[PDB]
Write a protein that binds this ligand. Sequence first.
Ligand SMILES: Cc1cc2nc3c(=O)[nH]c(=O)nc-3n(C[C@H](O)[C@H](O)[C@H](O)COP(=O)(O)OP(=O)(O)OC[C@H]3O[C@@H](n4cnc5c(N)ncnc54)[C@H](O)[C@@H]3O)c2cc1C
Ligand SMILES: Cc1cc2nc3c(=O)[nH]c(=O)nc-3n(C[C@H](O)[C@H](O)[C@H](O)COP(=O)(O)OP(=O)(O)OC[C@H]3O[C@@H](n4cnc5c(N)ncnc54)[C@H](O)[C@@H]3O)c2cc1C
Lengths: 461, 461
Amino acid sequence: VASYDYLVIGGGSGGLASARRAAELGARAAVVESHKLGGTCVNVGCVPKKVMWNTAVHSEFMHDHADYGFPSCEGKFNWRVIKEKRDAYVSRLNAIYQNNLTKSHIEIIRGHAAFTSDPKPTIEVSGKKYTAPHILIATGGMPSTPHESQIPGASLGITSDGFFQLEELPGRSVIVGAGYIAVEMAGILSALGSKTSLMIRHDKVLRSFDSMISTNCTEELENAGVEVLKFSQVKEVKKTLSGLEVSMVTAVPGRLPVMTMIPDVDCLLWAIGRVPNTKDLSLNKLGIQTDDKGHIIVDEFQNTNVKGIYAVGDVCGKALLTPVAIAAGRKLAHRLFEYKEDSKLDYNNIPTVVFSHPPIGTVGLTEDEAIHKYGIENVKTYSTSFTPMYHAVTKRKTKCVMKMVCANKEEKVVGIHMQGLGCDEMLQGFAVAVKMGATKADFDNTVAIHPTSSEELVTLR
Amino acid sequence: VASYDYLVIGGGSGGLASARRAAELGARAAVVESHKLGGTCVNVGCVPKKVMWNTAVHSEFMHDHADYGFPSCEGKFNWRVIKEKRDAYVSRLNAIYQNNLTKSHIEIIRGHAAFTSDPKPTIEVSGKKYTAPHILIATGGMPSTPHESQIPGASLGITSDGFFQLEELPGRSVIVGAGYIAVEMAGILSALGSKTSLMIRHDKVLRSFDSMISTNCTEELENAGVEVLKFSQVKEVKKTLSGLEVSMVTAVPGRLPVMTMIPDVDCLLWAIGRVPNTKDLSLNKLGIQTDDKGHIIVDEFQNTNVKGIYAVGDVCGKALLTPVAIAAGRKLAHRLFEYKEDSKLDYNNIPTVVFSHPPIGTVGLTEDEAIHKYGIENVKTYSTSFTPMYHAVTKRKTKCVMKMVCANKEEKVVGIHMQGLGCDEMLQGFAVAVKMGATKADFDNTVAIHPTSSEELVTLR
Ligand SMILES: Cc1cc2nc3c(=O)[nH]c(=O)nc-3n(C[C@H](O)[C@H](O)[C@H](O)COP(=O)(O)OP(=O)(O)OC[C@H]3O[C@@H](n4cnc5c(N)ncnc54)[C@H](O)[C@@H]3O)c2cc1C
Ligand SMILES: Cc1cc2nc3c(=O)[nH]c(=O)nc-3n(C[C@H](O)[C@H](O)[C@H](O)COP(=O)(O)OP(=O)(O)OC[C@H]3O[C@@H](n4cnc5c(N)ncnc54)[C@H](O)[C@@H]3O)c2cc1C
């Protein structure tokens, strides 16, 4: 039984970040990883997604070429070219992460970890035992798929993982789900030329975002050529002579349900949720608490219910983002190895960018959330809607919408929501301002940068 | 003699902003404008410049098309197409500004104003007299050109004004100056296909910016195909059979001076400075103080040396930006018509974006300035340099450099300097944070947005 100061199960964002900081602090750490280092984020998430987004962004910009004084650009996007380049780049990152671990003197234990029956918390990987007084579970999650029992033929569809395996651009694609991943995938496939449908159970996407954003985002998708199938769900999927045939039920409220067949589908992409990876951990041997989806339950300090066992990142099921897993993993290392007992991540005011077209940036409370927290009488919002100057000379148009949610007399900024060209890079510093507790006067007292989109947020009235 | 509450001379950024706010406050105002409303900013500055920048940005992005999986885009940029569209857009803005004035009930007096000999400050426009207890001079500036006495043939060159009159893309262009305008023009002309040279008196451009920025900016220009002629200046210009011939002296220190002829020049663009527009105002009839360049001298509240006479914007020669003129003009209206005596613009921490390729964003003190303000022992900087993820798959490359200047033990953020893709939209919120007095912990405690360039500023170590 090899003993370490810190054993981290999972070599993705949270697990690596935590292991690296711990090692800086003098801890003797080891990371168990059964697949590729970098985990979701590098292999099938953040990185490959962004590359595909940059590609889709090229496609749109190329539509404006002639408007800008150039000759029309004519053609066909070649999926395999970019796919090969994207894979290579992921390969480069995996090699860097491995090197980062080595330079830090962190041991990499390759294989699938599981807890043992042993009294003092101990794991087994490939027959060998490993123990530490602090063990971090950072095993992440996976895409959720429907059971054949509920939706026959569901296994004919792919997930976001399968999306990163595709080698050709699917001619006809149907995406099921209304969350950010669904939105992102629909936007990429459509911009690159796939005849794309997005099938959502209600009338808008991103229903948990501020309502200005869910409305605007739904319209932008339609305007970009994505067919949004509202109040619809899949009833069955079948393999026809040439592709898939999707049977769906549309049930608009105030109307009779109607069943429709969608034929000749090349790609059926389930983007319905993520499930935690805890199933094969043998958690029950230690009696570690999970919720009914399999998420590990933790407190504000990432503690599980068992002493010396922690969990961070996707596996915990809250704020499923690369930077949160990292920040939580880091704060945890400072708490354990630097003896900073108050060291923990604040889960409020975490900013998010959704890589739609145009991108979305959000931080803090939606208007409804502020209304429930402070009361209608105490909430004031400011908003603007305009066409960015980039489109002054284009036939194709996109809008920029921004909304500021203020609370109390002081007009504290408690929420910022926007969608528009450049909003992906614009959000970070306002997130800093929001975290510091800025009020509207603080924004108003900052001299604008002209001509930009960003200047609209400091000149709202 | 028609009397008003407020008479504003100049209908550009500062003059309009001040007049509009004053009118909201109940003032009976009139704006004197001898040319087009919107002034520099709309007609020959900010707006038309940005449109030309967006165009140049299209040209660069089109170089990456094939790398992104598309077929090579082949050609020739058509200057007149975009020029016509740009003019139209400026026409649209002029009509809006005029309407804004009318809706506000502000009187527009068309013509050239000059002060009179009269005791109580009074102006004359087209034979008629006008007076007010508060008169704002906001007459802006103009491009500076060399005297034929010092540089013979200088009048064969054009200025940034003339740039906006061009109808064809000049084949060979030489830009003289090393400030932001020179840099911007060089970058646009070059990206659009002009064989461009930038002639600077020293070895770097933007010598007043933080030294990381002047160095990086000079390299980016060279990398983009702009020939930077260092330690050079124009000695004479002459009209040859086919274009202009520029005689220049290059005097590298530690070397003998060398004279060179630059032949076949289509466009010689002077971007050497701006001069205030005060010359024809008859300021001396009131004894209003100017410096030796013709700038009107004012105090912290925009007061001139004469009671009831103020000046804002370019004419004052400090912080020559559209938003500063606006903010100063607004604060002034609140002071005069809302009786807010402490109402004035803080000229510290004004953010600037330079529309180079990639763009530059700066706010606060350069490293040297912080060193002079706090002492070397009290200044700590953090910086990063990386290749944005956008170029992971391109043969063409650009860099992103960021620098954070902190002061004292607390590591107050006193300067942010960066150059890179997206830095034009990234700066605004960090400018808010800097204005609020953020420290490095405030940045560090803000969760990053992945994957973006902006996230680098919150993860500096
Ligand atoms: C398509 C997609 C796009 C996304 N886009 C973004 C985005 O743009 N921005 C953003 O912030 N977030 C994004 N996310 C979310 C972000 O990628 C995740 O929140 C983050 O990767 C979670 O990190 P983690 O450390 O919890 O787990 P992960 O990186 O999944 O790491 C878990 C690791 O544990 C390994 N493992 C699991 N069980 C075991 C075991 N028993 N033994 C050994 N090893 C094990 C797994 O192989 C894996 O390598 C995206 C996610 C997806 C799916
Ligand atoms: C090429 C270029 C690019 C620029 N790019 C940017 C940028 O991207 N961002 C930015 O922030 N700033 C930029 N600037 C600077 C910005 O445009 C100026 O700081 C701003 O326009 C100054 O406004 P102002 O109100 O002082 O004067 P102006 O807008 O020049 O207005 C002065 C007005 O007074 C009128 N006038 C003058 N004398 C008289 C008189 N006697 N009687 C009646 N009317 C009179 C003039 O016709 C004019 O309309 C740029 C400038 C230039 C030249």
